[PDB]
Design a binder for this molecule. Structure first.
Ligand SMILES: Nc1nc2c(ncn2[C@@H]2O[C@H](COP(=O)(O)OP(=O)(O)CP(=O)(O)O)[C@@H](O)[C@H]2O)c(=O)[nH]1
Lengths: 79, 426
RNA sequence: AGCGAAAGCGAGUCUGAAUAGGGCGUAUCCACACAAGAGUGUGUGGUGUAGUGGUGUGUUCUGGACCCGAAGCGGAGUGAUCUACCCAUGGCCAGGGUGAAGCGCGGGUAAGACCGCGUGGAGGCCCGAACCCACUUAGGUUGAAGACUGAGGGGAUGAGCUGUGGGUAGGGGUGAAAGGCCAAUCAAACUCCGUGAUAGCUGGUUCUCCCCGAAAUGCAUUUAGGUGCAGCGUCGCAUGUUUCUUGCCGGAGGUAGAGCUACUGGAUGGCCGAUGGGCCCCACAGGGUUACUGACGUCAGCCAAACUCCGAAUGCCGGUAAGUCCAAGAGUGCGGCAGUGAGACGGCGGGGGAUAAGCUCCGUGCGUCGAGAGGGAAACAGCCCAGAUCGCCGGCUAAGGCCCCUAAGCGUGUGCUAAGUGGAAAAGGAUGUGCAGUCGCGAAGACAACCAGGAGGUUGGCUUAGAAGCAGCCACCCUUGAAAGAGUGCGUAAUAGCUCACUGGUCAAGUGAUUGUGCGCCGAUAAUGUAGCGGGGCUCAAGCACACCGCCGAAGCCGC
RNA sequence: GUCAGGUAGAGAAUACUAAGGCGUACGAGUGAACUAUGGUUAAGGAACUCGGCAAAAUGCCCCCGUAACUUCGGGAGAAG
RNA sequence: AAAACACAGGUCCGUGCGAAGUCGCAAGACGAUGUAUACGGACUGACGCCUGCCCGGUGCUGGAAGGUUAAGAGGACCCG
RNA sequence: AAUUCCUUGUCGGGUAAGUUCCGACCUGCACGAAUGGCGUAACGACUUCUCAACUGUCUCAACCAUAGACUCGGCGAAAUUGCACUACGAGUAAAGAUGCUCGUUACGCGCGGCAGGACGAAAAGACCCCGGGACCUUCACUACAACUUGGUAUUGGUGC
RNA sequence: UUGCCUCCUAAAAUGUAACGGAGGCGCCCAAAGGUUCCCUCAACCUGGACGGCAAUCAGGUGUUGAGUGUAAGUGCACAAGGGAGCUUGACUGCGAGACGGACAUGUCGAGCAGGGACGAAAGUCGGGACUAGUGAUCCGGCACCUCUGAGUGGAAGGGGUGUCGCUCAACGGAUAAAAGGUACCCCGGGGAUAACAGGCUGAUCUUCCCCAAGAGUCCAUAUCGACGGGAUGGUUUGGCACCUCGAUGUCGGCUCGUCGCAUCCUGGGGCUGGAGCAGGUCCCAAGGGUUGGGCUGUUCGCCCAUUAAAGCGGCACGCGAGCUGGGUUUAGAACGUCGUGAGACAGUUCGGUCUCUAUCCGCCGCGCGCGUCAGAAGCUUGAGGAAACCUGUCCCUAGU
RNA sequence: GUUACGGCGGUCCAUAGCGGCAGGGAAACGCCCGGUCCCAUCCCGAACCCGGAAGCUAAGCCUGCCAGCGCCGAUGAUACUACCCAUCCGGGUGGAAAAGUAGGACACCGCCGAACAC
């Protein structure tokens, strides 16, 4: 005599963490996603739950490949 | 009025009395009625109990048998060929665990959908409502767990508890009150019928009417015997309001022919109460036309059932019952080789077919014969300065206009009291 | 002097195979080399380290712990002088009836059985005062009285009533059993003590000014009116513009919108039309005809919170240049002290509901009230204007206003309204009145008018009482082209009168249909009294629209 | 708890009185409504009302006369 | 104030005698100076005609062949 | 039916008219034999119906007398109480206004009466919810009294 | 219903509630894990012995519509999809830097060393394409250890590392261990929260309408009006919980009224399928009037007699500081049914205390005072208000 | 320098792709002719791998035309939208789509150049 709904999960705080042009450290998490909505580019690896992370200091720079997004890092070149 | 879904029905019924064939005949109407409401009929079990059970209509184990069949065919309903009390139809619900809604409820509901005129709708709600008054505690959800009470009764002082009455009383009062408004409303509609029939009342006219059970024709005989095309659907209760048309034979006096609603066996004694239109007619007529189908297993049955309702009418109104003609139809197209039996002992078993096959010739010529006496007869000598003597002399309803001369006209015809009247100068 | 669970070691130490990472320590700072720019390390020199004990103040622990207030729990006692029952010994019951056993005598019977007449005086017997109750009614109901009174009422030789003296005591007594009674108290009496019981609950908490100034949110909870932590406030210390606003630059998205031949569903008409049903030749070999159905295909028109080939505006993250800068009284870290954790309404975007509520639940660098005075909305926390340091018998204004109430305009120019519209309302009905175009006739005097025009085979059929121009109706190729159609409508059963598409002398502008374009009319409709302008009153606008000109108006702004 | 006068009367009821004791502690007025307690009522006689609540009615002695039913006592002061 | 309690009359169960039952920690007392035709408890409730079927559940009573199981007796084997 | 929801079941009596009453039927929502079944003379301040007699119960009220009420003299309280020279209508407000808005009405002060309002007085709502008590029940938990079972001490001897 | 995972609501970052809308999870796999290498579906056309239409084999067409252990989403044809050969990294000592964040938890990590697997070596490997498949602390069990050992030597006990024990599923887990009744009730609070009345709304209710398919002897509109649509009123059942729980007394009846008109009679009309007598509709109209009984607690309802008629509603469902107390709603008792039982029924039946001296406004009557430009007296005008307002039968006109 | 092979260019990976018609073989790329050897098929020297060098541009690959199918796509309007104004409607200042239209487009550049000169 009631609703057969009413249960949800928790909101996993996904999405992009570092946006483009932002100076980053070695090992910071750039994107926490589920699939590969962003594929890893240069100096960017992929974790076990498909999160991307930095492999070198620099500045995160979004890009493209053959029909798929990438998240790159360009080095910051100390003056 | 309630409208949901079914189409899955298992019919049940106690054979307290009647022949075997007679017994399954009832269950059969129930099939036709069930389908006339539009729902597929699966199985159908009948028992032989000399008298129903005060708790479950059929029995205890038979209820158990029905419980499994409802799980088998998944039928969402069960209809009982009888009138059952609120209690019996509530116990049998926890047994089979599905609809246990009786016959009177099928008929009362068919009348809700099939009926159009506003008047017809009102009479329905009365019926449905009078059928639901005696079922309030049973539908006791409003009282289901209405145990919220225990109101203190220190009394002789503040209680501020307003109910100065039990909830059952207060609630019963409402349904009974609405029923009373409708009651006065329906009795008023009487004046509308009477006023729509003032012309016919005056100018006395003949008035044949067509009684007879449902599915016997009636509205086929009218659509053919005169003219006009009224609903002639092959289902049940297809005419929920009376119609009247003109027509005549040699005596053109209207032989106004009315068509009525159908008298099924064992009326639900509810919606019929307000179906007075059909009966107001039976009373005020000059003949009746009991139509019975030859394509019926036993035609004689409906003859008596129908005749009974006509019996009660003549009784209340203290009337010399009108002449009645019983015309058998469905013959010719007679899906009946049991035809000869009726013919052995049946009055006016005309092979009316109403469909193709006609058969209406003998009836028409034998129709005006039973109608009440005419009252116009006259032979006269009319001067040549007529131009007026034609009053209605030729131009009248039955004015004969059947004799002539050279001198004006030695007319020899028939004339009503208010028409040619006494004016005629022999 | 620290690290370690510890043995122990000691500016180190623990874990580890590690001379290798880390963890916790070596007060902090400055200088110099070597490394490393994976975010700074490592050694060498200097400087060199702050605790403790009185005591003022703010929180806090254990104590009654800011104050007041339960129903009830335990220990030891007091009560049977009221009431419940019982024990011992006394007292009382006017008057009048009825007539049991027993006995005697007659009748009666084998006898018994019983039946009359005397005698007798029985009974939880009858009528009825004292006495004991308390059934009905009325009065009292700050009473004469903390349970009575006046009338009636029940028992009254009994399971009766009553006096004196005794006995049973609290988780116990006593109970012809009502949770009744046990000193006007009873689902466990009263008094004193533990005791200042304990209450997430209610109430109360007392002199002043100055500065700052909230919240009704998130998570968890034997939790939902409580509390813990975070958020927001204040005070102190440290850093210094890191905060905020605007412009430019670099990014991720999938809402609004749109689209569907780009997926998944729904879905309106056609067209080809296999594949199947009827009929089919009834061979099941087989001719196809198909009001059926026709998967896919195909043409055109569509829809979607859980459809997306696309896809904004804003918002968000970062960078960069400025602004504000004798102030936002900005941000951030650490401490002392909190309160708050029931929000309300209005705007915009949504769920639940009937796309009801002054309904309910969310979002919103949204607002006001809460915690906000002043002016306008007639009055009127949540709407509009505006944020009160004090004084003034100074000036300018905001929202709103300027006929009188009531400060300032019965203001100026051009138009509209006849409804008191203004000063409530719908589907819909409708010959109101201004505007603007359009269409034939179109100052030819068209149109209106007085008017000759009356049964063309006109009683046609369809049929015949006649179908009496004319019950009804399915057509007006029709003309001296005049202005009547095989004469329709009112009528007229039949007559009989006149027009409906219609017109000739007299001759002076009219016929529709649009934009709905302004403003208006009806629909319209409760119950104390006009009562749907705040009042009087207003069309001689004091109403409406568009321009224009002043002024009144607050604790706003200026002056002193 | 004890005494218990006289007339009526079955009575210790009730009415009036003897012996004896009291006038018992706010009064004087005054035809208001209204309330309480008594009294009377035309014609009708439960029509009132939840309900004959209340009121009215019956009432004593002496002769007659007494039903269904019965557990044989009664009912019974039946009723009249 | 009653239709409720009691009641005379029923049946069942317990009790062989400082009985059963009750008050009391115990002695003791009531039962009763009573003795199963007596006493206590339960239900029914004058009187008349009657009181039907069921012993699976749960109780009560009466039984034993096995299973199960406490303390007390037992002390192999192991360990310090 | 002190038991029947449907229900004012149906039929018969009683009344001019009978949701109550009496007698039957039986379909017993959900009677039933010592939580006794069905009857029954007598009995009841018990409950429910009908009738005769009677009446101010009523149609429909009227009059009389006492005790109050009312006037005069003496004595002389009470509950209640933020204020006070405490109108009405249509509105507006915590949504039901003597006290706010706009009107309308109204000279000041008393005495006898009536009870519409002051959400009138009295009693920190007996109903409802939350929190805490209390007493009661049981196949709720955990204990204890009481009853019962065995070992062992008081407790010993000869037999087999 | 209570914890975890996925989608939408969720307003293009993250987050976001409701007893909003849909589903899953308390596993499985010793290969369905690690690694090296290879491959590309589904469907459609043309072909067979079945084999349907669709089982294996041919040739084409086919870029993703198939398949991924399991819900959904995000992905994946470069494949994470299909196949094969070895194997155990489903490791030990660690972990720069971060995400998320009340806290407790949770999550991702390049890289260094030891010992391996697979590869030619580049390198990959700390379980599975990802996100669920779980439980804090306390108290104990077990294996190993270069810790401690109550005078000393041992030992018992304790300690470290690895790990095992809970539908503590009310899933941040009050106790190792716990159900009901109260109408016999009591106390502390609450209009934070219900019953009565009021307020907002108007689904249901009620009263009107708009269009006109039909009905009405023929005939949409004399009289009705279906399917659909638009509203008024605030008298019903409701929805919300805004005042009142340091009290706003609750049905029916009695007594007393006052108001609205949506008119029952009486009074005017229009239309009639209005011959007359009687009617049926619609408009105008609120001055007066609108009965007595039987049954029921009853309002309502049916019935008996009448009448010109026996109106509908508002006023705390008007009216208890004006009355009753039949009913509902305390404590007693009984029946039927439910519960093992205390007790329950929103079933029935018998019985069950109705308090108050009127202060203020209001209303009905009655005085005293002053005023009305000197003090008195007789008789009056009427601004303004109040009261009343009903109706029948018979006769003549006329049996016209 | 002409230049008809590689590998990634690497391109916000179809303006680059499919589909037609006509052409080419210097070296290179290829089909090809056989498996004795290294190594291979769940069966097959088909493929993988090996040894070759008789023909021949059928095909892959490359070149030139085609706007046929797909693919990019403006300007201007329109939807929508932030802020502001407005007593009920609706406007102003900025930003601006989707679909369509005009059109674009049979790719363009790097490298030891790889080959081929002089
Ligand atoms: N086979 C057949 N059927 C006939 C004949 N005559 C009449 N019928 C049937 O009778 C029916 C018509 O009569 P109907 O209109 O049903 O009578 P009705 O009583 O008005 C139906 P309702 O119950 O609604 O009033 C038709 O369905 C037709 O099948 C006949 O001659 N032959």
């Amino acid at each position: 005599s009631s609703s057969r709904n009413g249960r949800d999960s928790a909101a996993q705080r996904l999405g992009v963490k570092r946006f483009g042009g932002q100076v980053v450290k070695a090992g910071e998490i750039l994107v926490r996603q589920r699939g590969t909505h962003f594929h890893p580019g240069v100096n960017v690896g992929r974790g076990g739950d498909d999160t991307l992370f930095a492999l070198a200091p620099g500045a995160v720079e979004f890009g493209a490949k053959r029909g798929r997004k990438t998240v790159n890092i360009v080095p910051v070149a100390r003056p | 009025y309630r409208q949901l879904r079914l189409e899955r029905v298992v019919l049940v019924g106690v054979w307290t009395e009647g022949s075997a064939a007679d017994a399954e005949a009832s269950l059969a109407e129930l099939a036709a009625l069930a389908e006339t409401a539009g729902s597929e009929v699966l199985e159908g079990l009948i028992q032989r109990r000399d008298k129903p059970d005060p708790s479950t209509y059929i029995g205890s184990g038979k209820a158990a048998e029905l419980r499994e069949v409802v799980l088998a065919t998944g039928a969402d309903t069960v209809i009982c060929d009888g009138e059952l009390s609120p209690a019996q139809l509530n116990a049998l619900e926890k047994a089979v665990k599905v609809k246990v809604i009786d016959r009177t409820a099928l008929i009362l509901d068919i009348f809700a959908q099939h009926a159009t005129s506003r008047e017809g709708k009102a009479q329905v709600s009365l019926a449905q409502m009078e059928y639901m008054l005696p079922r309030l505690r049973g539908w006791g959800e409003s009282m289901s767990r209405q145990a919220g009470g225990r109101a203190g009764g220190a009394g002789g002082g503040v209680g501020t508890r307003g109910p100065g009455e039990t909830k059952i009383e207060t609630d019963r009062r409402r349904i009974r009150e609405r029923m009373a408004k409708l009651r006065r409303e329906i009795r008023d509609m009487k004046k509308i019928r009477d006023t729509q029939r003032g012309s016919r009342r005056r100018s006395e006219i003949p008035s044949v009417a067509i009684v007879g059970y449902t599915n016997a024709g009636k509205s086929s005989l009218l659509n053919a015997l005169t003219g006009a095309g009224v609903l002639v659907e092959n289902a049940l209760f297809a005419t929920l309001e009376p119609t009247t048309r003109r027509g005549e034979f040699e005596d053109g006096r209207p032989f106004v022919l009315t068509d009525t609603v159908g008298f099924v066996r064992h009326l639900p004694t509810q919606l019929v109460e307000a179906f007075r239109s059909t009966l107001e007619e039976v009373v005020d007529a000059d003949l009746l036309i009991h139509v019975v189908d030859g394509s019926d297993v036993n035609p004689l049955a409906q003859i008596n059932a129908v005749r009974t309702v006509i019996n009660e009418v003549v009784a209340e109104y203290d009337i010399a019952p009108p002449p009645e003609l019983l015309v058998v139809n469905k013959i010719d197209a007679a899906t009946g080789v049991g035809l000869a039996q009726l013919r052995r002992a049946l009055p006016d078993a005309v092979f009316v077919s109403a469909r193709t096959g006609d058969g209406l010739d003998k009836l028409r010529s034998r129709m005006g014969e039973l109608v009440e006496s005419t009252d116009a007869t006259v032979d006269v000598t009319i001067p040549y300065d007529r131009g007026d003597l034609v009053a209605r002399v030729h131009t009248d309803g039955h004015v004969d206009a059947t004799e002539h001369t050279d001198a004006g006209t030695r007319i020899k015809a028939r004339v009503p009291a208010p028409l040619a009247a006494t004016l005629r100068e022999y």
